[PDB]
Nucleic acid binder design. Structure first.
Ligand SMILES: [Mg+2]
Ligand SMILES: [Mg+2]
Ligand SMILES: [Mg+2]
Ligand SMILES: [Mg+2]
Ligand SMILES: [Mg+2]
Ligand SMILES: [Mg+2]
Ligand SMILES: [Mg+2]
Ligand SMILES: [Mg+2]
Ligand SMILES: [Mg+2]
Ligand SMILES: [Mg+2]
Ligand SMILES: [Mg+2]
Ligand SMILES: [Mg+2]
Ligand SMILES: [Mg+2]
Ligand SMILES: [Mg+2]
Ligand SMILES: [Mg+2]
Ligand SMILES: [Mg+2]
Ligand SMILES: [Mg+2]
Ligand SMILES: [Mg+2]
Ligand SMILES: [Mg+2]
Ligand SMILES: [Mg+2]
Ligand SMILES: [Mg+2]
Ligand SMILES: [Mg+2]
Ligand SMILES: [Mg+2]
Ligand SMILES: [Mg+2]
Lengths: 124, 53, 49, 128, 53, 53, 187, 147
RNA sequence: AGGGCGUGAAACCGUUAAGAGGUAAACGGGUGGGGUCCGCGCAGUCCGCCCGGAGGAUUCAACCCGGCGGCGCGGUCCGGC
RNA sequence: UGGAAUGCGAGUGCCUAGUGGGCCACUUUUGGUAAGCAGAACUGGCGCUGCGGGAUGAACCGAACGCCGGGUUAAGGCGCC
RNA sequence: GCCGUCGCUGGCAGUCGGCAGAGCGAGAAAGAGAGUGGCGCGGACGCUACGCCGCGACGAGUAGGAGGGCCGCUGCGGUG
């Protein structure tokens, strides 16, 4: 279960990183990257990830489907959103709210999908 | 847990100290949610003491 | 008066809580019909039951 | 073009000088690192007047501004590019400090990334 | 003659084996040890017997 | 828990064959990292060789 | 300065279990929630007992659970234990019992289930009756440990039936001087 | 594990946990059980009473297997046979009485402590106790001896 | 790295630079003076919204097709496990 | 009507280091001409303890200590240091 | 004002959101209970629960004890 394998992963993971009085986590689908039960991207039954698109532009969104749970290959679904800065932040918002899909992660997903758009504009 | 080990002499898998290890589903379950006092989620920080005189 | 008002703190829950409102005296000494800082002053001055 | 923090509070420190060791001045074998003097007749651990001071717990820093550099940022050792994305959602409160060993070929492609990610680097002109 | 070797209860070595097998069928407890199994089709990865050939 | 799924054997070409095997009950035993560690840090003291001046 | 004494300022109760197992540290999470969020002083006792060491929550015997659940009035109740429910081979008839313990030995699961009783867990109990209504808290004998026979007044002392620490017990192992009224004295 | 021990927090304190006034000398009381009668008498009398002297008869060539006699109590007597032997006598109606052979389980003497279930038995044993035999008659049953 | 030659610390010494000097020196608290470098200081933060002001897109809503995913007390749909 | 007042959460169990050279003071006090002497009682100290005062000071008077700002005191003081 | 210890065996799984209704500081044991008859698709942070938050009181110390060290040294199994 989630709380069970979290009580195993909370301190002896391999993504856990502990230096300078901070403790982040390098899980694939951990958004805010911080080591917590709520934001861990491997423990839960339904997670959310917001990575940058493989090319220059766009933001990929990685939902974890329910049916396939012990099948890592066919477990995650991915959708590249290469749109303006606002429609993508209303699509992630709908993807999470209207689906009622892990709804406490929405503002985290928008805050990350904005960091990506900001880190993909032309620098100054 | 019902059929013993055949290749070992007498061994059965260790029993479980708790079965439903998902205390999220346990905690937001109508069985338990009804038997709780309302949450006291207001923060009452120290009130500065002015002088009634 | 000067003492109860300016330096008046109540031993609530074994915590020195400053008496800022009458609902701190009523909540504890209420069962003795002492419900305000005035009933408190009257109980102290006129040594009561 | 400085990368400002989220909020820049006032940093107050209860003491600035180091805590030198008793009699670290008459000798060279006695380093400056602190050692609580435990001798019987010692004048420092009796807290005499005008003597050296002792690291009490009273000197602790405000937890709100503890470990916080004078740039209003906390810090993080970064050994390679991949350890920045860990820091990209803590942008306006933590900074990066590329390690001492990361060669200049990698440190250039680390400051390069942290520029896009708007992460602040404390030693961005380090090696070159 | 320092005590180099330790002995463990058999039922406890078996508890540890069953706990080290029950934890190898969880994508989180395997992807957290570091293994790169993002594309393994199923965790209790079984293959036909011809593999021994 | 109690529900033991049906894992599917994978042919040597990667594609899933027709054979299925019911998840053995060992893969539901309790995960006890403390027992696993206590057993590991004692059993690997045994393969150690003496040394002394 | 104030003239108080800090000899006893630090209350020594257990704030949490010393064990590191995760099927106990999850029960303690669920019951710490029930303990603080309900007004039932049952959960508070279960929580305070989940901290206790392995010597403070001792085993129960099936027979002592029989005679403590046969007392008049407490029928159709669930016998809660925090330790383990060992077997008691010197009892022949077993009734049906609803039980909830941390462990039940593999020869007491047999007897209880063949009788027809239920064997719940602490999470099943917490779902059945959150506030713990219909339960019977029990705990095995604490002075049962052989350790508690050496405690008390030291041996060799008037009317101190305390067991001494001896390598072996025999004719010539502490039977000569402080025990015989003949050789010296006795207490 | 030295890193957990107490000599790792005792680095920097002069006496190493052992006293400034009274040092940690080598043997300030003698070695071993010395002074059992002179200067450790309060301890050898408060905690090991009867440690000094003789009592009883000697027995030179004692062999611990002439006096071998392990006992079993009546409470756990019915645990020597299988379960379908105690319940088969319950369902039984022809009054037959199962033969519990004790020396076959590994006990010689039968002591009678516990209660018994109401059914007949035939207890074969080497030595019997008076009460162990009365608790068997009072339930109906025979106490066979086996040399 | 120059034949006891990898790195080459400390005590001790030489010379150069800077300051200082009659209560041995050193020391803790407090400031001030001068130096050394640093900030790559020297016209000083950005961010969201809205209003207006000038421009540029192959662009919004709504419909149609295809795929994907969530949910379903599909009161109680089919077949599985 | 929990049978005086005032105050305060108590009870119990194991395991246990260091100590077993002490010294000073008010008052009582034994030996001694007496002693910064030898010896007891009660309480408080020094030892284990800084700080303000007594110029200085183990023990006297005040007062007991986390690191800081303002205010006021104790015991001592206020020609100058 | 700040740091820390102790106590409250304190509070927080209620982030219960167009399957929504946003509360449990208030002197007075207990339900913002059920039934039965007279447009605009929007809402910060949190929760490494070994975590986070709120309240008061406290802070000397030799010999000695205990705890916490994301203090440090060298090697081993893992892992970056
Ligand atoms: Mg000296
Ligand atoms: Mg001294
Ligand atoms: Mg104080
Ligand atoms: Mg103290
Ligand atoms: Mg204590
Ligand atoms: Mg010490
Ligand atoms: Mg010494
Ligand atoms: Mg010691
Ligand atoms: Mg000694
Ligand atoms: Mg010794
Ligand atoms: Mg003698
Ligand atoms: Mg060289
Ligand atoms: Mg070389
Ligand atoms: Mg050289
Ligand atoms: Mg010069
Ligand atoms: Mg001595
Ligand atoms: Mg004298
Ligand atoms: Mg001394
Ligand atoms: Mg003292
Ligand atoms: Mg003093
Ligand atoms: Mg004088
Ligand atoms: Mg002041
Ligand atoms: Mg003067
Ligand atoms: Mg202290």
């Amino acid at each position: 279960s989630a709380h069970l394998q979290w009580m195993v992963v909370r301190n002896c993971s391999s993504f856990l990183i502990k230096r300078n009085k901070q403790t982040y986590s390098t899980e694939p689908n951990n958004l805010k990257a911080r080591n917590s039960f709520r934001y861990n991207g491997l423990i839960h039954r339904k997670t959310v990830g917001v990575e940058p698109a493989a090319d220059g532009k766009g933001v990929v969104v990685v939902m974890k489907r329910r049916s396939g749970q012990r099948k890592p290959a066919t477990s995650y679904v991915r959708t590249t959103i290469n749109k303006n800065a606002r429609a993508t932040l209303s699509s992630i918002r709908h993807m999470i709210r209207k689906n009622k899909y892990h709804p406490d992660l929405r503002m985290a997903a928008i805050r990350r999908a904005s960091a990506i758009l900001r880190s993909q504009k032309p620098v100054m | 847990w019902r059929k013993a080990a055949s290749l070992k002499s007498n061994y059965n898998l260790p029993m479980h100290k708790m079965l439903n290890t998902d205390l999220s589903r346990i905690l937001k379950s109508p069985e338990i949610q009804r038997a709780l006092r309302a949450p006291r989620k207001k923060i009452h920080r120290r009130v500065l003491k002015k002088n009634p005189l | 008066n000067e003492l109860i008002y300016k330096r008046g703190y109540g031993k609530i829950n074994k915590k020195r809580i400053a008496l800022t409102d009458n609902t701190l005296i009523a909540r504890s000494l209420g069962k003795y019909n002492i419900i305000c800082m005035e009933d408190l002053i009257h109980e102290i001055y006129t040594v009561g039951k | 073009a400085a990368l400002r923090p989220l909020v820049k509070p006032k940093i107050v420190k209860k003491r600035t000088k180091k805590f030198i060791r008793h009699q670290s001045d008459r000798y060279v074998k006695i380093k400056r690192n602190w050692r609580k003097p435990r001798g019987i007749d010692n004048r420092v651990r009796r807290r005499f007047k005008g003597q050296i001071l002792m690291p009490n717990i009273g000197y602790g820093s405000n937890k709100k501004t503890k470990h916080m550099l004078p740039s209003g940022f906390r810090k993080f050792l970064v050994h390679n590019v991949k350890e920045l994305e860990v820091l990209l959602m803590c942008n306006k409160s933590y900074c990066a400090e590329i390690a001492h060993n990361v060669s200049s070929k990698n440190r250039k492609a680390i400051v390069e990334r942290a520029a896009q990610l708007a992460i602040r680097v404390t030693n961005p002109n380090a090696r070159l | 003659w320092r005590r180099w070797h330790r002995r463990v209860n058999t039922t406890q070595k078996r508890y540890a084996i069953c706990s080290a097998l029950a934890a190898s069928a969880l994508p989180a407890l395997v992807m957290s040890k570091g293994h790169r199994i993002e594309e393994v089709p199923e965790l209790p990865l079984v293959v036909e017997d011809k593999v021994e050939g | 828990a109690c529900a033991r799924p049906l894992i599917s054997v994978y042919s040597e070409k990667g594609e899933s064959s027709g054979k299925n095997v019911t998840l053995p009950a060992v893969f539901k035993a309790p995960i006890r990292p403390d027992i696993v560690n206590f057993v590991h840090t004692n059993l690997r003291k045994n393969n150690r060789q003496p040394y002394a001046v | 300065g104030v003239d108080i004494r800090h000899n006893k300022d630090r209350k020594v109760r257990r704030k949490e279990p010393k064990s590191q197992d995760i099927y106990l540290r999850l029960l303690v999470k669920l019951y710490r929630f029930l303990a603080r969020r309900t007004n039932s002083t049952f959960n508070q006792v279960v929580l305070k007992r989940l901290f206790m060491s392995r010597t403070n929550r001792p085993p129960l015997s099936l027979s002592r659970m029989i005679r403590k659940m046969k007392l008049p009035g407490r029928e159709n109740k669930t016998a809660v234990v925090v330790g383990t429910v060992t077997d008691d081979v010197r009892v022949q008839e077993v009734p049906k019992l609803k039980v909830c313990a941390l462990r039940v030995t593999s020869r007491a699961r047999s007897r209880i289930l063949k009788a027809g009783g239920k064997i719940l867990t602490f999470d099943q109990l917490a779902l059945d009756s959150p506030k713990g209504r219909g339960t019977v808290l029990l705990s095995g004998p604490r002075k049962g440990r052989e350790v508690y026979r050496h405690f008390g007044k030291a041996p060799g002392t008037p009317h101190s039936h305390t067991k001494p620490y001896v390598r072996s017990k025999g004719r010539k192992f502490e039977r000569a001087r402080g025990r015989r009224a003949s050789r010296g004295y006795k207490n | 594990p030295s890193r957990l021990r107490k000599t790792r927090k005792l680095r920097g304190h002069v006496s190493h946990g052992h006293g400034r006034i009274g040092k940690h000398r080598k043997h300030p009381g003698g070695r071993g059980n010395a002074g059992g009668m002179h200067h450790h008498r309060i301890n050898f009398d408060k905690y090991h009473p009867g440690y000094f002297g003789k009592v009883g008869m000697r027995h030179y060539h004692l062999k611990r297997n002439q006096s071998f006699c392990p006992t079993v109590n009546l409470d756990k007597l019915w645990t020597l046979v299988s379960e379908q032997t105690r319940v088969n006598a319950a369902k039984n109606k022809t009054g037959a009485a199962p033969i519990i052979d004790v020396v076959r389980s590994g006990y010689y003497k039968v002591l009678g402590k516990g209660k018994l279930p109401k059914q007949p038995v035939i207890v074969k044993a080497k030595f019997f106790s008076r009460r162990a035999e009365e608790k068997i008659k009072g339930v109906g049953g025979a106490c066979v001896l086996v040399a």
